[PDB]
Amino acid sequence: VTAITKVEREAVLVCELPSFDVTDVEFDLFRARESTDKPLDVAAAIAYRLLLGSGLPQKFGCSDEVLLNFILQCRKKYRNVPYHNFYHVVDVCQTIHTFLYRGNVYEKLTELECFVLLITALVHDLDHMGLNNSFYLKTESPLGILSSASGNTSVLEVHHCNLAVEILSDPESDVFDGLEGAERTLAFRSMIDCVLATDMAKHGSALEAFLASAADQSSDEAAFHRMTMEIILKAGDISNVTKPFDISRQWAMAVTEEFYRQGDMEKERGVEVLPMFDRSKNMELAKGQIGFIDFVAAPFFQKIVDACLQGMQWTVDRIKSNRAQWERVLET
Ligand SMILES: COc1ccc(C2=NN(C(C)C)C(=O)[C@@H]3CC=CC[C@H]23)cc1C#CC(=O)NCCc1ccccc1F
Ligand SMILES: [Mg+2]
Ligand SMILES: [Zn+2]
């Protein structure tokens, strides 16, 4: 990994985000990428501003310069695909900020854990290719063989953590260089546990573990913190349906295209194509999003808000209103 240049930092530092509250739950990132001919430089600046305005980096001896080196090292390792690009992880970073500060989840974690979560947001899909874990295993691709031989089914998640550790071994981009001993260890262990928990094959088990811990006054405090961090990164990662309908609708179009491309390759590759990755099935977005709301996101957000995160009620309100707007699209 080559170092970040004065050219690159300036490219970001000069962006001034006019009429945009990055801390707000309605902050639009799609309209912020259409307000400049350098959407990447804008995104980095959102991430930068988010990270400084928390007041966390400074407390953990992470300079403004290191922090921006880190963000730009991250952005370099994301790809030009429809969904799992840099815009996605900046989205997850900004959304996690709102759950922590507008939803008051910060009250449940240490400053270090809040710092770790905002950082983990940016590393959590590094060098994603627009193909799910399943694709790599069904095609017996090298990464799939390595994961299967290695004994770990989370193909992509382990890849993401490998690159994250790369970026942070170089002090010029190590946002944790200011930590030592237990704190430094916790920052790495929790960043990795969180990324590994983003695998949706573990979705049910991560959710049931967090709810069992929240209902237990005698849960180990360390383990409750860890499961809260994991649930918050998971929350961020399926937060598309908690946003204003047009923002949510845009995210779904990008993710439907990414699914479709995989299913185009799975066909020429001659492997099993599921209904949702098949273009010629031309399934209605309305029904997709209603399906996703009903089976994954509504139950998830309802249960964590009831269990523990009462401050995040608005997510359940917006999911409810977004669903009703899709039902209206159907009814007409
Ligand atoms: C804005 O929307 C979405 C954001 C995220 C995802 C994900 N889904 N998943 C897994 C649940 C299959 C992943 O692993 C992805 C990778 C990591 C985290 C979450 C990601 C799906 C969507 C959607 C949608 C849509 O319109 N119809 C898709 C088909 C569908 C229909 C009914 C129920 C579920 C379902 F996926
Ligand atoms: Mg992922
Ligand atoms: Zn993600």
Side-chain angles (χ1 to χ4, degrees):
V1 157
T2 134
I4 290 327
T5 79
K6 274 201 62 83
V7 172
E8 295 162 323
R9 287 197 298 292
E10 273 311 316
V12 176
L13 268 174
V14 298
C15 306
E16 279 197 323
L17 323 177
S19 101
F20 283 120
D21 194 346
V22 293
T23 78
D24 196 80
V25 310
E26 294 200 21
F27 163 90
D28 189 328
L29 169 69
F30 279 103
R31 118 130 77 279
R33 288 159 59 199
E34 292 244 301
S35 69
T36 192
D37 42 283
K38 340 213 84 188
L40 289 163
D41 286 318
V42 168
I46 292 159
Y48 187 61
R49 166 165 315 167
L50 273 172
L51 261 297
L52 289 179
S54 75
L56 297 163
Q58 307 97 312
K59 294 177 141 129
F60 298 110
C62 178
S63 78
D64 289 33
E65 192 191 33
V66 167
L67 178 79
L68 186 50
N69 288 332
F70 170 70
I71 294 170
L72 287 174
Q73 290 299 0
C74 286
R75 174 179 80 183
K76 276 188 177 176
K77 299 222 146 149
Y78 289 88
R79 287 199 186 178
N80 179 19
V81 301
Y83 184 83
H84 291 115
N85 44 64
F86 189 61
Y87 305 115
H88 169 70
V89 305
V90 175
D91 184 49
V92 170
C93 187
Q94 188 277 323
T95 311
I96 281 165
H97 194 297
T98 77
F99 296 165
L100 278 183
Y101 299 114
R102 305 269 180 176
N104 295 331
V105 178
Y106 83 79
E107 280 172 41
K108 290 310 209 322
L109 301 166
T110 60
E111 294 191 308
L112 179 54
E113 296 167 342
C114 289
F115 178 44
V116 173
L117 272 169
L118 293 178
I119 292 311
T120 305
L122 290 181
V123 305
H124 91 271
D125 277 324
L126 282 163
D127 177 53
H128 200 300
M129 265 82 73
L131 300 165
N132 69 357
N133 285 335
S134 184
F135 168 83
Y136 288 100
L137 296 175
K138 294 177 313 190
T139 59
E140 320 218 63
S141 91
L143 261 220
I145 290 158
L146 177 43
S147 290
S148 137
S150 255
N152 193 306
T153 351
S154 311
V155 187
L156 286 156
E157 292 72 25
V158 171
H159 187 59
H160 305 323
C161 291
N162 277 316
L163 305 189
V165 160
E166 246 173 73
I167 290 179
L168 302 167
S169 60
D170 161 28
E172 300 285 65
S173 54
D174 187 3
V175 297
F176 307 131
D177 185 47
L179 313 180
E180 203 41 56
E183 282 191 342
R184 185 159 174 84
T185 299
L186 196 166
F188 278 93
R189 191 43 193 257
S190 65
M191 163 178 89
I192 285 164
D193 290 339
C194 285
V195 181
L196 290 174
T198 61
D199 187 334
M200 285 299 297
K202 295 178 184 147
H203 170 80
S205 73
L207 177 56
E208 185 47 51
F210 170 79
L211 296 169
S213 181
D216 174 21
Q217 276 160 244
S218 294
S219 185
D220 182 275
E221 182 196 349
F224 178 68
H225 282 236
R226 189 49 54 75
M227 283 188 274
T228 300
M229 295 179 71
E230 302 184 339
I231 259 338
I232 295 297
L233 183 70
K234 273 187 69 39
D237 206 29
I238 67 176
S239 63
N240 293 166
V241 296
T242 69
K243 301 317 172 76
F245 181 90
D246 189 70
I247 275 159
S248 166
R249 191 192 129 264
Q250 275 182 265
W251 284 128
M253 277 182 344
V255 76
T256 302
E257 180 47 30
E258 194 172 288
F259 287 167
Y260 281 168
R261 286 183 191 183
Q262 160 164 339
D264 289 356
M265 282 187 72
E266 291 185 310
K267 278 177 173 176
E268 171 79 16
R269 181 124 351 186
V271 298
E272 192 194 50
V273 188
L274 294 174
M276 55 178 240
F277 297 82
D278 193 352
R279 297 186 171 284
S280 70
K281 258 278 181 72
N282 229 310
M283 259 131 182
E284 286 159 65
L285 197 64
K287 259 147 186 181
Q289 295 297 289
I290 284 166
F292 184 80
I293 286 169
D294 283 354
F295 291 109
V296 181
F300 177 79
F301 281 98
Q302 171 270 305
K303 278 164 173 169
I304 66 173
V305 169
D306 285 5
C308 201
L309 314 180
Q310 280 85 37
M312 275 176 68
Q313 184 51 57
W314 89 81
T315 66
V316 169
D317 301 343
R318 190 76 65 168
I319 279 167
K320 204 188 131 77
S321 115
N322 271 342
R323 192 195 189 281
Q325 188 96 303
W326 288 113
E327 277 283 23
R328 263 178 219 119
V329 169
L330 295 185
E331 202 192 358
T332 68

